[PDB]
Scaffold this active site. Sequence first.
Site, PDB file in Angstrom:
ATOM      1  N   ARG J  44     -47.526  -6.955  51.220  1.00  0.00           N
ATOM      2  CA  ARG J  44     -47.616  -7.953  52.278  1.00  0.00           C
ATOM      3  C   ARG J  44     -47.632  -9.346  51.673  1.00  0.00           C
ATOM      4  O   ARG J  44     -48.489  -9.652  50.840  1.00  0.00           O
ATOM      5  CB  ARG J  44     -48.867  -7.727  53.120  1.00  0.00           C
ATOM      6  CG  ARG J  44     -48.758  -8.229  54.524  1.00  0.00           C
ATOM      7  CD  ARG J  44     -49.939  -7.771  55.340  1.00  0.00           C
ATOM      8  NE  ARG J  44     -50.319  -8.764  56.331  1.00  0.00           N
ATOM      9  CZ  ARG J  44     -51.242  -8.571  57.260  1.00  0.00           C
ATOM     10  NH1 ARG J  44     -51.877  -7.418  57.368  1.00  0.00           N
ATOM     11  NH2 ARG J  44     -51.522  -9.551  58.114  1.00  0.00           N
ATOM     12  N   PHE J  49     -50.133 -17.751  54.467  1.00  0.00           N
ATOM     13  CA  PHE J  49     -51.312 -17.023  54.918  1.00  0.00           C
ATOM     14  C   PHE J  49     -51.971 -16.209  53.812  1.00  0.00           C
ATOM     15  O   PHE J  49     -53.099 -16.528  53.425  1.00  0.00           O
ATOM     16  CB  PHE J  49     -50.934 -16.114  56.096  1.00  0.00           C
ATOM     17  CG  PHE J  49     -52.101 -15.405  56.724  1.00  0.00           C
ATOM     18  CD1 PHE J  49     -53.374 -15.934  56.658  1.00  0.00           C
ATOM     19  CD2 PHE J  49     -51.922 -14.196  57.366  1.00  0.00           C
ATOM     20  CE1 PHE J  49     -54.442 -15.273  57.233  1.00  0.00           C
ATOM     21  CE2 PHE J  49     -52.983 -13.534  57.940  1.00  0.00           C
ATOM     22  CZ  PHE J  49     -54.243 -14.070  57.873  1.00  0.00           C
ATOM     23  N   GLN J  52     -51.188  -9.772  50.286  1.00  0.00           N
ATOM     24  CA  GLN J  52     -51.981  -8.557  50.253  1.00  0.00           C
ATOM     25  C   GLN J  52     -51.313  -7.486  49.408  1.00  0.00           C
ATOM     26  O   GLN J  52     -50.087  -7.380  49.364  1.00  0.00           O
ATOM     27  CB  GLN J  52     -52.215  -8.016  51.658  1.00  0.00           C
ATOM     28  CG  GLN J  52     -53.298  -6.970  51.712  1.00  0.00           C
ATOM     29  CD  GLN J  52     -53.612  -6.529  53.112  1.00  0.00           C
ATOM     30  OE1 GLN J  52     -54.218  -7.266  53.873  1.00  0.00           O
ATOM     31  NE2 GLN J  52     -53.192  -5.325  53.465  1.00  0.00           N
ATOM     32  N   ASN J  91     -59.840  -5.166  55.099  1.00  0.00           N
ATOM     33  CA  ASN J  91     -60.599  -4.168  55.833  1.00  0.00           C
ATOM     34  C   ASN J  91     -59.939  -3.921  57.182  1.00  0.00           C
ATOM     35  O   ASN J  91     -59.070  -4.679  57.620  1.00  0.00           O
ATOM     36  CB  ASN J  91     -62.067  -4.592  55.980  1.00  0.00           C
ATOM     37  CG  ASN J  91     -62.240  -5.866  56.786  1.00  0.00           C
ATOM     38  OD1 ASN J  91     -61.289  -6.393  57.357  1.00  0.00           O
ATOM     39  ND2 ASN J  91     -63.468  -6.368  56.832  1.00  0.00           N
ATOM     40  N   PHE J 102     -56.442  -9.427  48.962  1.00  0.00           N
ATOM     41  CA  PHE J 102     -55.389 -10.399  49.223  1.00  0.00           C
ATOM     42  C   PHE J 102     -55.804 -11.755  48.675  1.00  0.00           C
ATOM     43  O   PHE J 102     -56.978 -12.004  48.402  1.00  0.00           O
ATOM     44  CB  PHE J 102     -55.071 -10.513  50.713  1.00  0.00           C
ATOM     45  CG  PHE J 102     -56.192 -11.059  51.538  1.00  0.00           C
ATOM     46  CD1 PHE J 102     -57.141 -10.221  52.081  1.00  0.00           C
ATOM     47  CD2 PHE J 102     -56.282 -12.413  51.795  1.00  0.00           C
ATOM     48  CE1 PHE J 102     -58.163 -10.725  52.850  1.00  0.00           C
ATOM     49  CE2 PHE J 102     -57.303 -12.920  52.561  1.00  0.00           C
ATOM     50  CZ  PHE J 102     -58.243 -12.075  53.089  1.00  0.00           C
ATOM     51  N   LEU J 111     -61.307 -17.313  59.280  1.00  0.00           N
ATOM     52  CA  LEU J 111     -61.385 -16.000  58.664  1.00  0.00           C
ATOM     53  C   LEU J 111     -62.669 -15.766  57.881  1.00  0.00           C
ATOM     54  O   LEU J 111     -62.804 -14.712  57.255  1.00  0.00           O
ATOM     55  CB  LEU J 111     -60.182 -15.793  57.746  1.00  0.00           C
ATOM     56  CG  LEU J 111     -59.628 -14.378  57.664  1.00  0.00           C
ATOM     57  CD1 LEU J 111     -59.491 -13.801  59.055  1.00  0.00           C
ATOM     58  CD2 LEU J 111     -58.299 -14.376  56.947  1.00  0.00           C
ATOM     59  N   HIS J 115     -64.382 -10.685  56.474  1.00  0.00           N
ATOM     60  CA  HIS J 115     -63.690 -10.569  55.199  1.00  0.00           C
ATOM     61  C   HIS J 115     -64.588 -11.072  54.081  1.00  0.00           C
ATOM     62  O   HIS J 115     -65.180 -12.150  54.189  1.00  0.00           O
ATOM     63  CB  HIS J 115     -62.377 -11.345  55.217  1.00  0.00           C
ATOM     64  CG  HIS J 115     -61.325 -10.712  56.067  1.00  0.00           C
ATOM     65  ND1 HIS J 115     -61.207  -9.348  56.211  1.00  0.00           N
ATOM     66  CD2 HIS J 115     -60.347 -11.256  56.828  1.00  0.00           C
ATOM     67  CE1 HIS J 115     -60.199  -9.078  57.019  1.00  0.00           C
ATOM     68  NE2 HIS J 115     -59.661 -10.219  57.409  1.00  0.00           N
TER      69      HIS J 115
END
Lengths: 301, 94, 155, 49, 50, 21, 134, 37, 98, 154
Positions: J44, J49, J52, J91, J102, J111, J115
């Site tokens: 990812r 952003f 990951q 998660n 990530f 966020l 996390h």
Amino acid sequence: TSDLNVPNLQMFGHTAEVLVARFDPSGSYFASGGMDRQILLWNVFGDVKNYGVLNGCKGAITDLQWSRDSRVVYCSSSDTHLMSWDAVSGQKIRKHKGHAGVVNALDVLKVELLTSVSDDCTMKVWDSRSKDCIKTIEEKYPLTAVAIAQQGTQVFIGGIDGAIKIWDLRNNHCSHVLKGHKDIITSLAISKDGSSLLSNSMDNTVRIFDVKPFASAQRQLQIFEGAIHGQEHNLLGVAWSRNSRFVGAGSSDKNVYVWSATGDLRYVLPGHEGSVNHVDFHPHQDIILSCSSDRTIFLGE
Amino acid sequence: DSEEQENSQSPNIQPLLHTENLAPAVVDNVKDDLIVSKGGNSRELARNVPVNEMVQPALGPANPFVTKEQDSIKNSITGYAEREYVPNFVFNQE
Amino acid sequence: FESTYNEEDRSAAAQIVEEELKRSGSDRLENAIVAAGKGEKLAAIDVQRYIQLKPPGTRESLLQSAVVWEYQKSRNDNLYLLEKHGEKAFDSSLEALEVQLELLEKELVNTKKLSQGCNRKRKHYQMEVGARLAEAEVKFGQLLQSSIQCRVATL
Amino acid sequence: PDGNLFVAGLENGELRFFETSSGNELTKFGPHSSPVKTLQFGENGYWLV
Amino acid sequence: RKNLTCYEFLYNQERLALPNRLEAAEIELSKMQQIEAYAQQDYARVTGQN
Amino acid sequence: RSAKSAGNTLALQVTSSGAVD
Amino acid sequence: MFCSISGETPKEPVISRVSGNVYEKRLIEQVIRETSKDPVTQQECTLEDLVPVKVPDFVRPRPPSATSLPALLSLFQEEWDSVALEQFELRRNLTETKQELSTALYSLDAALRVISRLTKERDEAREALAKFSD
Amino acid sequence: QELSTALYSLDAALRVISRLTKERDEAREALAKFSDN
Amino acid sequence: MFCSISGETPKEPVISRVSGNVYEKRLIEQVIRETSKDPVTQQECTLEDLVPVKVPDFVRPRPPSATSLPALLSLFQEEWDSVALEQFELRRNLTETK
Amino acid sequence: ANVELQTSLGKILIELYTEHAPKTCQNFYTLAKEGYYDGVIFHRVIPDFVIQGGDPTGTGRGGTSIYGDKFDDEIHSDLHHTGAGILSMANAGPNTNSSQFFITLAPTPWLDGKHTIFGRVVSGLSVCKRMGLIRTDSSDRPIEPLKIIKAVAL
């Protein structure tokens, strides 16, 4: 976890919807039939190919039953007939006539006794050779499914009313009914020991009842949700495992539902394109059989 | 006055014979289930699997740049279409 | 094994087993002699009188002076030898030590993995059989109820 | 009778069981009350009174 | 290695022992079935009047 | 920032310790 | 790099054919002198079964005080005392482990007698329940 | 090896006895209640 | 610690039975696979002639720095031969001076 | 606590926040010690952003911690996503942390919830800035495999 070459085997054939598929009691064969007026015999182990076609039926094979001898086949036809097919040679042995409508279900006995129900609101007991109904039971509303106890005195019939009626062939005393359902009963099945009754109804609830002469009231053991019925009013089957600890059913949402008989859903495996008509389990290993109105049937684990 | 030595030391790794096993037993099965099920891909999954691990989470921080057009999974530009074996009569009546 | 037990049950079972218990019921010669000696420690004693460095006296002082001189000469030779090369041998010893550390820990974690695998498979088998035993005992209890209720219902 | 061990009950109800040859107590049986008046062994080997 | 070999021992002892437990439970099931069968047949002779 | 993939991905340090590809 | 017998570093390690293990010449030769076999594998062993391999050998950096004289005799005495202490700490430990093993084995036999008695009591109790069902 | 083996087998047999006596006394109380009426 | 076949150190060492040599598993199995011969001493060799390492063992290892009675006795013997060589040379010089 | 990541684009160095969140960093540390991160695809990558990765399956799912399936996240106040390079955990629920993680590419203040923050990238941020420009298909996944050749912990 079995002797299958591949864990999952999609089976192709037929030209129309398949309505029934039942394993041989020995566990090496099984036959399937549907709206194409043909019955196909399969090989559970090996190349899994066709060795026989049962041609001659003049109607849809609503239901069929294997014989304990595993050499003759009884089929239920939509043309108001019941034919006995010699599996090894594929010839018409006898054609039992006498109903007055589409015969919906069929069951065999442990002794050469056949039972069936049809839309003429009647149930008939057939001897394998008498070619005529030895006993006739007449109901108010069309019946849809039967199960005979292997001990050989009780038949369970299910129809429009929504209450399973238990009939004693010799006594003709019917004052005992397994109430609890509220819609048409699609199918019935008896346990290997003959102690419990498995029912499916179009009110989307699969229930399990106990076949014992004595009960502590509320013979209802437990009920199961999830398996739902569509708008085609198809007759969806229920099955019993070889060890009688897993109960199975099909649904019109293309999912096969397997339970642990203790109220917890275990398998909800999808895989079908249409309504799943019938389901069965292998008598020796942990295989499951699927039967759906998308011209296809699946072998299991 | 009891036999503390004969009992406390005896159940030290005997509890670990029960407690240590639970540690990595949740590792081999977690990756094996994904390997078998996702090895068959979302379409044509090959391993029949019990229901309770069917939630199938994506396990990500949920990318917020996506707009409402791509939130949906589709084959054609307009939407998702798949075969269904409906008999004629039910389709017609409904 | 799969069960939910209190340690008090462990104590009770231990007292049962101890109640039943109560009811029912190379070496050489030099090494052996010096061992009988040193069992009470008794550290061996040898002459350490080469640091006193006796003042001018009898033949003992001359003998002592000579032995100290020769030990000192040998000592100086050994040190000059030791720094003829330096600590290179020390570097090789450390490298071998690191090699042995890693070589041991590799098979250590391998053994941890094997033991954990055995434990996991044990837990799988025991848990499935235990679930079957639990369902068996539950069905037996319900069956007991059914038998007694039917028998009284006969009346 | 075998002569390998013996028993001897005590006033507080305990039983002093010792091997005859070793001469050391290795068993105490104290479930009784009051002075145990007597004890006599049998002859078949496995009958006691 | 101590615990590894010990766990191997425990594996062998469980694999030997548990089938005996299963057999005992199955025999108990068989006998309980027989006595239940006899009781329900008695109630079935009663049911002959139903 | 909206540049997207206007150019080829820069050469990769391959697994064979080859500095650049 | 560590011999299986004493744990010292073998300056001339050898390997066997029945079971190739890092062994030292003097120990295996004296074992053959005692019994002409290999007790590790319980098989006959001869002198030729070992092969002289080439190793750079493990250097031993001497401590700050090692120049013969007391710097050696005192350390020799102290290491003697230490190996002696280890000899006792392993003998007495052997004896204690044997006593503990005997006690544990007797307790295990007692537990087996207990499982037997409780098993017969179990069987008869379950049979009593089943017959009470009558 | 033998010591740890014997001790852990003792623990296993102890748990066997614990479960056995527990359900046994429960079953005896059950029979006592049942036979009372 | 060095391999003759490639010149690099063997990541997983192995000792050849026919001829004492330290190989790495991949190349030694390579030379066995291509032929049953020794790459060094050109003599027949097989997979079983390759001896893997069983270093762990079960005894207490010992430090090759100070706590070794063989090391102590070897130091005594090196001192012994050193003083012997000294006596040798000085005795030779003494007889020349005589 | 310090781990190097030999990635295809370059070299990534991470210093772990052992003092803040010890439990969630020791697994990463010993995991690089075990080093099954070899040949693991950064499945990812989203412009600005995250990046990951960390699942051996490579299907955006899976990943086993040392505890085996999941564990508990620890978060306290002073931790924030205020920068671009904070190394955090991935998660799929309340406490569902797995082996995969990530790297942050822009301030994600929203966020700092479910996390866990356990790292900061001291060196190699240019490698992440270049990873932000990698060809990506319709889903958030690079077209070419962005494998990690090796992960050495130091």
